[PDB]
Amino acid sequence: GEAPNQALLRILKETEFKKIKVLGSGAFGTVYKGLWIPEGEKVKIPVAIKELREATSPKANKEILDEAYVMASVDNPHVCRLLGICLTSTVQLITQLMPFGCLLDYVREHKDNIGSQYLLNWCVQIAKGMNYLEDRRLVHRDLAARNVLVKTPQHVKITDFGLAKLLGAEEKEYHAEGGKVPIKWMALESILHRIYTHQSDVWSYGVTVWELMTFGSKPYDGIPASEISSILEKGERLPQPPICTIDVYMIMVKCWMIDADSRPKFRELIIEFSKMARDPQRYLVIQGDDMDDVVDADEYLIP
Amino acid sequence: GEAPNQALLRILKETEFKKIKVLGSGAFGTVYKGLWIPEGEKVKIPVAIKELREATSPKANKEILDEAYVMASVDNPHVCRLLGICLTSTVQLITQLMPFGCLLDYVREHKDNIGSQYLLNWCVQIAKGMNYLEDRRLVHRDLAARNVLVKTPQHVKITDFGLAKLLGAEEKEYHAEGGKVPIKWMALESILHRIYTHQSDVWSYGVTVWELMTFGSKPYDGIPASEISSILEKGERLPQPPICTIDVYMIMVKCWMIDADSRPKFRELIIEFSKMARDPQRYLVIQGDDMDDVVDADEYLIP
Ligand SMILES: CN(C)CCC(=O)Nc1cccc(-c2c(-c3ccccc3)oc3ncnc(N[C@H](CO)c4ccccc4)c23)c1
Numbered sequence: 001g002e003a004p005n006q007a008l009l010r011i012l013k014e015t016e017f018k019k020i021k022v023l024g025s026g027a028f029g030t031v032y033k034g035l036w037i038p039e040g041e042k043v044k045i046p047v048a049i050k051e052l053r054e055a056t057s058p059k060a061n062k063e064i065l066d067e068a069y070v071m072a073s074v075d076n077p078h079v080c081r082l083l084g085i086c087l088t089s090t091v092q093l094i095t096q097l098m099p100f101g102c103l104l105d106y107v108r109e110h111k112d113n114i115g116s117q118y119l120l121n122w123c124v125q126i127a128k129g130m131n132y133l134e135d136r137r138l139v140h141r142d143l144a145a146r147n148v149l150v151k152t153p154q155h156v157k158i159t160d161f162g163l164a165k166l167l168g169a170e171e172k173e174y175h176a177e178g179g180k181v182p183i184k185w186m187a188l189e190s191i192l193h194r195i196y197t198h199q200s201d202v203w204s205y206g207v208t209v210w211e212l213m214t215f216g217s218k219p220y221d222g223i224p225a226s227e228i229s230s231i232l233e234k235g236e237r238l239p240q241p242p243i244c245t246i247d248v249y250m251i252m253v254k255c256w257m258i259d260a261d262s263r264p265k266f267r268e269l270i271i272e273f274s275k276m277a278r279d280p281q282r283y284l285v286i287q288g289d290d291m292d293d294v295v296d297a298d299e300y301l302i303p
Numbered sequence: 304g305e306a307p308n309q310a311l312l313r314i315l316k317e318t319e320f321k322k323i324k325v326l327g328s329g330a331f332g333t334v335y336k337g338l339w340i341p342e343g344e345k346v347k348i349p350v351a352i353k354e355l356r357e358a359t360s361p362k363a364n365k366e367i368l369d370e371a372y373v374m375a376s377v378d379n380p381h382v383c384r385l386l387g388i389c390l391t392s393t394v395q396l397i398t399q400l401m402p403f404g405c406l407l408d409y410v411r412e413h414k415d416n417i418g419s420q421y422l423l424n425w426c427v428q429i430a431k432g433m434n435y436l437e438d439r440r441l442v443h444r445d446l447a448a449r450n451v452l453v454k455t456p457q458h459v460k461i462t463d464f465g466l467a468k469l470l471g472a473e474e475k476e477y478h479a480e481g482g483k484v485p486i487k488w489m490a491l492e493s494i495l496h497r498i499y500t501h502q503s504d505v506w507s508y509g510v511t512v513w514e515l516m517t518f519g520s521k522p523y524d525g526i527p528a529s530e531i532s533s534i535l536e537k538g539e540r541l542p543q544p545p546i547c548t549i550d551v552y553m554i555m556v557k558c559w560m561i562d563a564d565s566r567p568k569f570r571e572l573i574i575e576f577s578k579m580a581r582d583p584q585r586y587l588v589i590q591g592d593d594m595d596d597v598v599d600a601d602e603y604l605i606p
């Protein structure tokens with residue numbers, strides 16, 4: 001008695017798409033920028049193509065395929081979806097290219113041009129995607145600014161479901177085992193007990209919001225991961241960003257409550273941030289949105 | 304019986320202004336970027352500061368002072384004016400900073416972002432300044448894109464009156480002697496007979512317009528200056544720029560008539576270009592104002 005997953009998994013021919021440039025290469029193999037040209041059509045779809053480091057690791061090949069299953073099962077405007085897989089020596093994942101890269105880097109290299117409208121609209125969009133994932137019974141487990149991609153400056157999508165997990169109808173949490181999840185974005189209960197829920201994802205959403213409001217600051221900049229558990233237990237949290245009114249900062253702090261159920265639901269976060277987005281300057285003070293006695297010569301008239 | 308020139312020549316103290324960066328250094332000494340802070344006021348005026356190469360040439364020091372006299376005698380929104388001179392070892396000229404540099408370089412390093420509206424509005428503004436100079440009885444003798452400066456992208460001013468000459472009420476032309484005037488911008492009669500009139504300046508205006516429409520192309524790119532006189536005599540002129548309709552190109556060609564009096568007057572050029580500026584796309588075809596089967600993945604829906 002569980003809803004059959006009738007997602008279609010498209011198998012693409014390597015000849016159909018053309019890699020163009022490497023976009024980056026972390027501990028997750030390499031991601032390529034490319035063009036997908038389905039033979040029959042008269043279309044050319046810009047795509048990102050992801051594959052693991054050339055060799056075959058048994059456990060890592062299972063995991064890509066697990067990530068394919070989740071990306072192939074999600075359909076929503078604020079969530080990156082799988083277009084298909086290409087079955088070469090190593091398996092390749094293909095998705096829509098998000099040309100402007102990840103949001104974390106974007107805010108960093110656009111501080112001086114990011115209005116409060118964009119910031120709050122991003123917050124709404126991330127909450128919508130997350131809320132969609134909650135509907136889909138999916139616990140992301142790796143929400144951060146670095147895992148949100150930018151299609152256009154006004155349109156961002158959640159991505160990177162390498163750690164995601166599907167919950168049963170008769171199931172409310174996920175108990176991890178292996179670990180190695182980014183400590184500075186995880187809820188306390190997850191650090192202490194390896195428990196992950198949708199409310200755990202809300203914690204991470206909180207930190208993600210903090211990242212954006214601080215234009216890409218690293219959470220707990222000096223602090224080594226070993227200490228994190230202690231300081232949270234004590235009742236320490238991320239500071240209030242300079243641009244943040246108490247109204248917005250209070251939303252952040254609510255995400256970081258010890259009682260997970262007291263934290264806001266994503267559906268609520270959409271409402272709250274939506275409301276704020278209609279009057280962005282009441283909620284984020286940003287100077288733009290070295291001299292002030294400067295006057296132009298054809299205003300300084302000859303005395 | 305000639306109108307007394309009651310222009311005021313302001314003498315500035317070197318202590319009042321602060322050089323900040325060199326802007327450039329040609330055969331004309333160096334031009335500095337600076338801030339002028341008149342002691343009594345609470346103002347800070349951005350300025351360009353021009354001085355000859357450190358040494359004193361007798362003939363060249365006379366000429367700076369001649370250029371000071373003309374800049375100090377002009378007052379108009381489309382013409383750069385002298386703010387003052389500073390009497391140091393070598394004499395310094397001071398004017399309003401035109402931060403965006405000269406127009407020639409501007410069009411070159413903004414081709415891909417310059418609309419037809421900007422182009423035609425520049426043409427109007429240059430004609431207005433030139434027409435003002437004609438009123439002031441002043442023959443510029445060195446109009447080119449490189450001698451028009453940019454205050455803002457929408458506001459340009461004529462400058463560089465090192466070759467300018469003042470005409471008498473009972474006087475219609477200027478007969479040069481020394482020469483070394485840029486050959487590729489001068490009217491034929493000037494090349495042949497060293498005659499310079501306001502209508503000679505219209506020729507130069509023509510070439511200046513050609514420069515802008517070709518986004519900074521060098522006139523007669525292959526041709527050495529010695530040949531120029533011949534080819535013009537034969538009836539050869541600059542080609543029609545790609546973006547130029549026959550309407551606009553015809554204005555250019557009219558500036559290059561052999562009979563100087565047949566050429567348009569600046570007052571007429573203001574009208575004509577003004578008219579065109581109200582419907583810029585009827586007069587300049589620019590593609591913006593490598594694939595066209597490209598479609599975004601969240602429009603290519605799974606077939
Ligand atoms: C894995 N995670 C913990 C690190 C986040 C990360 O590095 N993401 C990443 C890395 C490299 C490229 C991209 C990416 C880009 C891109 C574009 C321009 C500049 C920089 C990056 O554009 C993208 N469009 C879609 N997906 C992207 N990356 C994801 C992997 O995070 C992806 C690609 C292909 C198939 C599945 C997922 C991308 C995204």
Ligand SMILES: CN(C)CCC(=O)Nc1cccc(-c2c(-c3ccccc3)oc3ncnc(N[C@H](CO)c4ccccc4)c23)c1
Nearest residue numbers: 326327334351352353396398399400401402403404449463
């Ligand atoms: C002399 N002529 C034949 C060459 C044209 C030329 O090189 N003009 C020039 C050279 C160097 C600086 C400037 C200039 C700039 C500027 C600003 C940013 C980048 C590049 C250039 O800004 C200016 N503002 C006002 N005047 C300028 N130059 C003129 C001389 O052409 C000038 C400066 C000071 C006093 C009188 C005139 C300028 C202008």
